[PDB]
């Protein structure tokens, strides 16, 4: 089991490091740059050197900060971001929860708790601004996102994650639920703070947000947690909505199709980052409570009525 822990936790770190590499390369090719060509064979040794620069640089111990929350927020942030992968399905999961969608929802809010403790105990006015726009960002996203997960699991009757692939064996859930799918992709952009809905990391209205005073080390480990959340909710959107064909004789063919689909979804995520301009904390909350919450309440209404109109009551397992 610990062999499965090490061989699931090491190559997800290699995968998010290469996600930061293909972020810099895909934003480069979007922006007519070439991306980090000069180190490694085509870029491969850049994020290993980024970790080996940012972990052999030192962090601060500031006077103004609180030291216990300063050292206990980023250890949480890497633990929760690497611990949302353990109920993820693949063919057969590392850990099969009975109800794992609530674990994904709650511990995804606990990542924003790590961000929020960084924002308060970093103890800058910039960091307090970043903490309160984390609060306003989750005020925008959280009710909408859980109504989306509820209203799609009115088609798959349990909260289990293997039940999603035995529901999505025959067809994807993009085709019955594309008004769910577009607003879920927008809401998980709001979850994982990417460049349309990236406030709270900021970089173009304020300086850094949650990691203003957080130097190298804990800023790197937040960066580890943030891009782990990027590849995580890319894979979660990939398994829940465009979940591929599932063969019980060939799970590796389905895993290759799932990984081509997940690299397409991650390229779509970074493509959205280098295609759209950035929101505001007022307009973000405004349209995620105005143009989303009546629409996702009506989609909750329609998927409540969907085991009555077409009489598909979902099974328990």
């Amino acid at each position: 089991f610990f062999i499965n822990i090490l061989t699931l936790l090491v190559p997800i770190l290699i995968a998010m490091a290469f996600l930061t590499l293909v972020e810099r390369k895909i934003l480069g090719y979007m922006q007519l740059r070439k991306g980090p060509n000069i180190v490694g064979p085509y870029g491969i040794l850049q994020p290993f050197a980024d970790a080996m620069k940012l972990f052999m640089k030192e962090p601060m111990r500031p006077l103004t900060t609180s030291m216990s929350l300063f050292i206990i927020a980023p250890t949480l942030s890497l633990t929760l971001a690497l611990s949302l992968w353990v109920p993820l399905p693949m063919p057969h999961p590392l850990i099969n929860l009975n109800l794992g969608i609530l674990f994904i929802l709650a511990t995804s809010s606990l990542s924003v708790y790590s961000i929020l403790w960084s924002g308060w105990a970093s103890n800058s006015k910039y960091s307090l601004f970043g903490a309160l726009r984390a609060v306003a960002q989750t005020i925008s996203y959280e009710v909408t996102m859980a109504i989306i997960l509820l209203s799609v699991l009115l088609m798959n009757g349990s909260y289990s994650l293997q039940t999603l692939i035995t529901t999505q064996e025959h067809m994807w859930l993009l085709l019955p639920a594309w008004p769910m799918a577009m607003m879920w992709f927008i809401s998980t952009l709001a979850e994982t703070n990417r460049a349309p809905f990236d406030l709270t990391e900021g970089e173009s209205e304020l300086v850094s947000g949650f990691n203003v005073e957080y130097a190298a080390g804990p800023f790197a480990l937040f960066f580890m947690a943030e891009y782990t959340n990027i590849i995580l909710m890319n894979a979660l959107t990939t398994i829940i909505f465009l979940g591929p064909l599932y063969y019980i004789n060939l799970p590796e063919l389905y895993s290759t199709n799932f990984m081509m689909e997940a690299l397409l979804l991650s390229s779509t995520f970074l493509w959205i980052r280098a295609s759209y301009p950035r929101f505001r904390y007022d307009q973000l909350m405004h349209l995620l409570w105005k143009n989303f919450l009546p629409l996702t309440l009506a989609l909750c209404m329609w998927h409540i009525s969907l085991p009555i109109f077409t009489a598909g009551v979902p099974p328990y397992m």
């Binding site: 089991f1 610990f2 822990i5 936790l9 052999m56 640089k57 030192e58 962090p59 601060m60 500031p62 006077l63 103004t64 900060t65 050292i71 980023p74 250890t75 949480l76 890497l78 633990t79 690497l82 611990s83 353990v86 850990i95 609530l102 103890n123 800058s124 006015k125 910039y126 960091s127 307090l128 309160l132 609060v135 306003a136 005020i139 959280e142 009710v143 859980a146 509820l150 699991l153 009115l154 009757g157 300086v207 203003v212 190298a216 080390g217 790197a220 480990l221 007022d282 909350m285 405004h286 105005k290 919450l293 009546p294 309440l297 909750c300 209404m301 409540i304 009551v313 979902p314 328990y316």
Partner: protein, 113 residues
């Protein structure tokens, strides 16, 4: 199982904090540990009272989170035998939530003060 995965995640991130702190060289002084705000010292203390501007929409975020935790047993309540009163109860409370958000939308407290 899951307690051991959570604890090896604790051990991995604590090992990363220990290799982030104890291995690099570090000299620290008062201007280095001075808090950053644009290149100057801050005007007041950084924990001075914020006057909050999203307060009523913050409380209806809290009450909407209580409604979605009310609405969380509904994927197993779709399997019940009294499905007429189940769908009437789900209809009347999603109508209650849409009318409450429509009241807040007409009263225009979504904008800050």
């Amino acid at each position: 199982n899951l307690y051991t995965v959570i604890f090896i995640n604790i051990l991995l991130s604590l090992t990363l904090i220990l290799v982030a702190f104890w291995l690099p060289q570090m000299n620290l002084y008062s201007e280095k540990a001075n808090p950053y705000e644009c290149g100057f010292d801050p005007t007041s203390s950084a924990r001075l009272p914020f006057s909050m501007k999203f307060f009523l929409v913050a409380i209806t975020f809290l009450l909407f989170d209580l409604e979605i935790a009310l609405l969380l047993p509904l994927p197993w309540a779709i399997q019940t035998i009294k499905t007429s009163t189940m769908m009437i109860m789900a209809f009347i409370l999603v109508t209650i939530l849409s009318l409450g958000l429509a009241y807040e939308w007409t009263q225009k407290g979504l904008e800050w003060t």
